[PDB]
């Protein structure tokens, strides 16, 4: 069987919290007044919800309302509990209210509003300095939630709201987030394909906060190299092949051998043999202004097969890549 794994940091945070902190199935929702909020326009539709711009008519302020589609109540309570636990933390989206929508017959989450620019358009304008700045701001959110016993499990550009005018960033969509408990086995059907960690792609269930660090590395690679997404797989199997063409097949075998994991035999015909590549091969005249030796070293230390070898969020904040970021 597979060798077990533990987080190298924040391992016991939920063990020593009171049960109420992580026992989201028992959480009792405090409902606000649904009539306080007037929907203005639909912003998006997801797998599990629709999201709207709205006005809070008790203060005439803009808010964002996420009306959940039907899903098991445990999942709804999990997201609500995590948002309440994390509220006030650095760059964590603020849950302002929870109301019962009379049409959907489901909960509607009310969030603070971020005047965001969509990442496809924002990322073609960010400078080297902008990228370092916003990466540091994401790390603040990730170190906070990890230190609070929570893994996000869906880090991707779509879930980072940036108001570029005010240099304001919020990490959103905590609907896939979970509490970390040592030895717990988790669903591997999390994160978006391009941001899935090797642990998910080889079906290793005893993963931890370090999953978010792989996803963050995928975001970094796409921004500094100007290739979005960086690892562009056509399905979950090809996703691992795309990663192996860069990190190499020998270290993939070292990873699964360490945890006594077997690759899906489907890979026998598609994986091939690949050397590990040097990151300099992805640098060219149209992205070199975003690349530095510090950026490549930092990226190299995030994108490790072995989840136990990746930088933690706190270690990442100590990396020389962030020395040029102005600290407040």
CB of 159 to ligand A1IYU, least distance (A): 6
List the one residue from 45, 232, 234, 276 that touches ligand A1IYU (CB under 6 A): 45
Residue 133: CB minimum distance to ligand A1IYU, A: 20
Q: Which residues have a Cβ under 8 Å from the Cβ of 200 and sit 6 or more positions away?
A: 188, 189, 190, 191, 207, 211
**Of 23-31, 97-105, 107-115, 265-273: span binding ligand A1IYU (CB under 6 A):** 107-115
Answer yes or no whether residue 139 interacts with ligand A1IYU by CB under 6 A: no
Cross-strand bridge partners of residue 107: 100
300 is catalytic: no
Say if strands 61-68 and 95-100 run parallel, antiparallel, or are unpaired: unpaired
Segment contacting ligand A1IYU (CB under 6 A): 17-25, 40-48, 185-193, 269-277? 40-48
Catalytic-labelled residue, pool 23, 118, 143, 154: 154
Tell whether 262 is in a known binding site.
no
Q: Rounded to an integer, what distance in angstroms lies between the CA atom of residue 136 and that of residue 17?
A: 28
Is 323 labelled as part of a ligand binding site?
no
Work out whether 172 is an interface residue with ligand A1IYU (CB under 6 A): yes
What is the C-alpha separation between 214 and 230, in angstroms, rounded? 12
C-alpha distance across the termini of the chain, in Å: 48
Instruction: Check residue 66 for interaction with ligand A1IYU (CB under 6 A).
Output: yes
Question: By C-beta, is 194 or 279 nearer to ligand A1IYU?
Answer: 194
49 is a site residue for ligand A1IYU (CB under 6 A)? yes
Alpha-carbon distance of 142 to 211, in angstroms, equals 11
Nearer to ligand A1IYU, 14 or 159 (CB): 159
Instruction: Tell the burial category of 191 from Cβ atoms under 10 Å away from its Cβ (0-12, 13-18, 19+).
Output: buried
Asked if residues 276 and 117 have their Cβ atoms less than 8 Å apart, the reply is no
Asked if the peptide bond before residue 213 counts as cis, ω within 30 degrees of 0, the response is: no
Residues that bind ligand A1IYU (CB under 6 A): 43-46, 49, 51, 64, 66, 93, 111-114, 116, 158, 161, 172-173
Active site positions, annotated: 154
């Amino acid at each position: 069987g597979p060798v077990p794994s533990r987080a190298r940091v924040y391992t016991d945070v939920n063990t020593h919290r009171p049960r109420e902190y992580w026992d989201y199935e028992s959480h009792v929702v405090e409902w606000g007044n649904q009539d306080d909020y007037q929907l203005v326009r639909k912003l998006g539709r997801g797998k599990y919800s629709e999201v709207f711009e709205a006005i809070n008519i008790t203060n005439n302020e803009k808010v964002v309302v996420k009306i959940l589609k039907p899903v098991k109540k445990k999942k709804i309570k999990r997201e609500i509990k995590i948002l309440e636990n994390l509220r006030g933390g650095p760059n964590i989206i603020t849950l302002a209210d929870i109301v019962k929508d009379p049409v959907s017959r489901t909960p509607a989450l009310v969030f603070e509003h971020v005047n965001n620019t969509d990442f496809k358009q924002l990322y073609q304008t960010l400078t080297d300095y902008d990228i370092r700045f916003y990466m540091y701001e994401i790390l603040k959110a990730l170190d906070y939630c990890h230190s609070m016993g929570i893994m996000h499990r869906d880090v991707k550009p779509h879930n980072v709201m940036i108001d570029h005018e005010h240099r304001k960033l919020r990490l959103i969509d905590w609907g896939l987030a979970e509490f970390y408990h040592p030895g717990q086995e988790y669903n591997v059907r999390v994160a978006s394909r391009y941001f899935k960690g090797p642990e998910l792609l080889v079906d290793y269930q005893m993963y931890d906060y370090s999953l978010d660090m792989w996803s963050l590395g995928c975001m970094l690679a796409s921004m500094i190299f100007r290739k979005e997404p960086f690892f562009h797989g056509h399905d979950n199997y090809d996703q691992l092949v795309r990663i192996a063409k860069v990190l190499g097949t020998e270290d993939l075998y070292d990873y699964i051998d360490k945890y006594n994991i077997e690759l899906d035999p489907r890979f026998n015909d598609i994986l091939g043999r690949h050397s590990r590549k040097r990151w300099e091969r992805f640098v060219h005249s149209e992205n070199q202004h975003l690349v530095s030796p510090e950026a490549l070293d930092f990226l190299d230390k995030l994108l490790r097969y072995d989840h136990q070898s990746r930088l933690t969020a706190r270690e990442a904040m100590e990396h020389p890549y962030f020395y040029t970021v102005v600290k407040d």
